[PDB]
């Protein structure tokens, strides 16, 4: 199916601190009111740039990146097992419909805390030979606004062209995928430094007017 990302998809572009000052940044971002695909499975997705990943819940698992998914180019293999995160950068014999049980029927080591009604928001940027992961979990695409903070950076320096998703099957399902586009926003911080509200810069004439005066309150008058 199809749905619309209302206002989510905003993250800290840098590791700086700002206190209640309206600042403008230009990075690879998710446009507001865009066309995010609601993929469902009981697949092969292109990766032109970073992607926006979101799901609700435990059969949803890790992810697989790469250029071709072959035995000639390194492919990211990020998996979770409810206690650890495993990253492998090698070449594997990928299959068409991979899943986990734990037998490995799917076919640079970093182990940390696992990321896992709650809503989770993941974005996977790729720029200048890096691989940055951003995570946030929120309770109640339902409406609302929240930030998105980085937790881990992976220096790999490989080209990524494809994107997949792993599942867990019991023997004895719904995730949103969006695409990033190059445009700018205008971010308003607060006293504690977290992002409170964001505005698009090229979405609407009023939004562009807010972008070109660096404020949220636009007084009565004519502006160029």
């Amino acid at each position: 199916s199809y749905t619309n990302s209302f206002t989510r998809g905003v993250y800290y572009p840098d590791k700086v601190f700002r206190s209640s000052v309206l600042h403008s940044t230009q990075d690879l971002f998710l446009p507001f009111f865009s066309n995010v695909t609601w993929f469902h499975a009981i697949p092969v997705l292109p990766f032109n740039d970073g992607v926006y990943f979101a799901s609700t819940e435990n059969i949803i698992r890790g992810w697989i990146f790469g250029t071709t998914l072959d035995s000639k180019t390194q492919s990211l293999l990020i998996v979770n097992n409810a206690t650890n995160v495993v990253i492998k950068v090698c070449e594997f014999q990928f299959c068409n419909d991979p899943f986990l049980d734990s037998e490995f029927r799917v076919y640079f080591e970093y182990v940390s805390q696992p990321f896992l009604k709650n809503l989770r928001e993941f974005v996977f940027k790729n720029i200048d030979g890096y691989f940055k992961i951003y995570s946030k979990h929120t309770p109640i695409l339902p409406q609302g606004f929240s930030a998105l903070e980085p937790l881990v950076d992976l220096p790999i320096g490989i080209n990524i062209t494809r994107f997949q998703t792993l599942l867990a099957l019991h023997r004895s399902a719904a995730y949103y995928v969006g695409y990033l586009q190059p445009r700018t926003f205008l971010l308003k911080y607060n006293e504690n430094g977290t992002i409170t509200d964001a505005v698009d810069c090229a979405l609407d004439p009023l939004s562009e007017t807010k972008c070109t005066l660096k404020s949220f309150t636009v007084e009565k008058g004519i502006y160029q």
Partner: protein
Amino acid sequence: LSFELLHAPATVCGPKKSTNLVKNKCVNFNFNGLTGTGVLTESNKKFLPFQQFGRDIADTTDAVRDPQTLEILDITPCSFGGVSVITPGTNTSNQVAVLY
């Protein structure tokens, strides 16, 4: 041993000679590659635990976090400013007064 180039950004190299700390003094520093000169002062802000340093409205580095501890140190420039000389005419006298 054989060294390799042009595969990835650099990810292995040794110690960088960490030094001690000074407070309430106009010294120059190098905090995670962020150079600058100022007075190191204890801060009262509340950083999020993923941000290396901070700026202000004037786009200058005023708050920095040392990678050894979890505390944050404010950056304020040390004493600067012009000097002016108060004097009468040299035909009158040679007494002068200095203003900062």
